[PDB]
Amino acid sequence: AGCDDKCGCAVPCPGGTGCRCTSARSGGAAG
Ligand SMILES: [Cd+2]
Ligand SMILES: [Cd+2]
Incomplete structure (x- = not known):
C-alpha cells in the first residue's frame, strides 16, 4: 500500500496507472 x-x-x-499493486508480478502484498 x-x-x-x-x-x-x-x-x-x-x-493509478503506476500502481501495480493489482495484477502485480512485481509486488503488491502489503505494498
Ligand atoms: Cd503502488
Ligand atoms: Cd504498491
Whole structure:
C-alpha cells in the first residue's frame, strides 16, 4: 500500500496507472 521501489511500483507511485499493486508480478502484498 505504501509504495516505494521495494513495492515494485512506480516511484513515486501515482496511485493509478503506476500502481501495480493489482495484477502485480512485481509486488503488491502489503505494498
Ligand atoms: Cd503502488
Ligand atoms: Cd504498491
